Amino acid sequence: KETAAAKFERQHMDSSTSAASSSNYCNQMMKSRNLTKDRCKPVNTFVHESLADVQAVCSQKNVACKNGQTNCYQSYSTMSITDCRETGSSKYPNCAYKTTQANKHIIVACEGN
């Protein structure tokens, strides 16, 4: 009930779309993944790639994490991704988010789960 791995999947995985819908993707998705139940999580990124493609990042380019840990890996190639971030005018429990679609190299922290 919630392992670090399922938390990760619940929060960032969206293999059901190749890219962000439209301007409301962050509103529905943040909602769906229950990232706004108690509060409005302020920032969250969705990866539009298959689970396996993302797990495979842990055997890609090893880099330091933004903290100094050594368990961070960078994807060799770019990935379709969606940046969800709270708009200056967002208050609980009516959380508004600005969806920003992009194609980027993701950096993930890995552990044996």
């Binding site: 791995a5 990760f8 960032h12 890995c110 044996g112 789960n113």
Partner: peptide, 11 residues
Amino acid sequence: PYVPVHFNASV
């Protein structure tokens, strides 16, 4: 099998 546990950054 080391799996992603945190989404650190983009690019």
